[PDB]
């Protein structure tokens, strides 16, 4: 229902955090989400850090709560929710990332071009959710 609603192509446009920005990437590819039988989401993104293209694949295991999913063997809760702005979504996430608990958020849109409108809404949500309030935008390419 909503797993199929958020399926397809997204641009990861903005990210913030409660902690620090580790190997925070130069450029990202489009984020692809595939709705799998049973309600899980397969997210795939490529990113350029220091001359390397890291492919990333994260399965979002469906919980019984609308919008709530687990990943990384249930150590990380991910909350999916639409922007008020058309064609945008926010991913809120908490739990351990890679050794340290990092409460995070991400801004998705169907179109690459930044919406100052979506970015405000992001800045509101993020600050309310507790944040360094250091909204970081992200450069975009179609391949890496």
């Amino acid at each position, epitope marked *: 229902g909503d797993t*199929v609603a958020v*399926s*397809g*192509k997204w641009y990861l446009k903005a990210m913030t955090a409660d902690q620090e920005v580790p190997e925070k990437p130069d450029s990202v590819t*489009p984020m*692809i*989400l*595939k*709705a*799998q*039988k049973g309600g899980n989401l*397969e997210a795939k993104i490529t990113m350029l850090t220091n001359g390397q293209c890291q492919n990333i694949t994260v399965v979002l295991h469906k919980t019984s709560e609308p919008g709530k999913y687990t990943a990384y063997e249930g150590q990380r809760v991910v909350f999916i929710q639409p922007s008020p702005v058309r064609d945008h979504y926010i991913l809120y996430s908490e739990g351990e990332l890679h050794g340290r608990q990092i409460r995070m958020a991400k801004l998705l849109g*169907r179109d690459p071009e930044q919406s100052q409108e979506a970015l405000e809404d992001f800045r509101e949500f993020s600050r309310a959710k507790g944040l360094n309030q250091e909204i970081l935008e992200l450069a975009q390419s179609e*391949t890496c």
Partner: antibody, heavy 126, light 107 residues
């Protein structure tokens, strides 16, 4: 209209080469996972090849690996199938199809082919 | 590789409910599509994601998928339902068609 039309079939000599075309109407060809499916007279559907909306991801049937490449020209609303080293096993009706579950705005792990062209016949005999 | 298995034929009298099966290893873990093909014509999608129906397709068509078996059920079968039916699913980098099933509606 919202349709797929194929062309470029005809009778060829074994070992030779042929390009098939698929003119799309009604949508944008790079927004969708697009596939080729064939069927030899009196037999069942055999899937041949696919390209995802990413335009880079490509899968073929073990039967045609090497010999065939799929592609698209968004500016001409056309999907292409390039066939080499044709053998008698390649004689068939060839169809382009659209996977409406592989779309920039809807991607489900379950190919569903809503659109089909009328087909273009390929015959590989001397 | 991954094989989808269909009884080659099925026949029913008009009005009778026709069942049409497709077997594969843990087929119930995938989404199956079904296609109808009448003679001299292009296949038509009748079922996708196991149970869902494109518009234009009558309610007498329905689908299920459990274990290793997907079933296409045609209730109150009509004369024009006479066609070849194909199941499809996605395995690994491969799209797979079953071998097809000639539903005859007896005349």
């Amino acid at each position: 209209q919202v349709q797929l039309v194929e062309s470029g079939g005809g009778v060829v000599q074994p070992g030779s080469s042929l390009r098939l075309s698929c003119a799309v109407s009604g949508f944008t060809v790079r927004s969708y996972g697009m596939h080729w499916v064939r069927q030899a007279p009196g037999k069942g559907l055999e899937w041949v090849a696919l390209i995802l909306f990413d335009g880079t991801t490509k899968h073929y049937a073990d039967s045609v690996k090497g010999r065939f490449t799929i592609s698209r020209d968004n500016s001409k609303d056309t999907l292409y199938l390039q066939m080499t080293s044709l053998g008698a096993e390649d004689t068939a009706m060839y169809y382009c199809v659209r996977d409406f579950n592989q779309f920039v705005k809807r991607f489900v792990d379950g190919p569903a082919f809503d659109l089909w062209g009328q087909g273009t016949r390929v015959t590989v005999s001397s | 590789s991954y094989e989808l298995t269909q009884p080659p034929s099925v026949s029913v009298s008009p009005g009778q409910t026709a069942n049409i099966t497709c077997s594969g290893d843990k087929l119930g873990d995938k989404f199956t599509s079904w296609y109808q093909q009448r003679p001299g014509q292009s296949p038509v999608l009748v079922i996708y994601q196991d149970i869902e129906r494109p518009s234009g397709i009558p309610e007498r068509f329905s689908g299920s998928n459990s274990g290793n078996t997907a079933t296409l059920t045609i209730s109150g079968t009509q004369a024009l339902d006479e066609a070849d039916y194909y199941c499809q699913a996605w395995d690994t980098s491969t799209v797979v068609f079953g071998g097809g099933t000639r539903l005859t509606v007896l005349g």
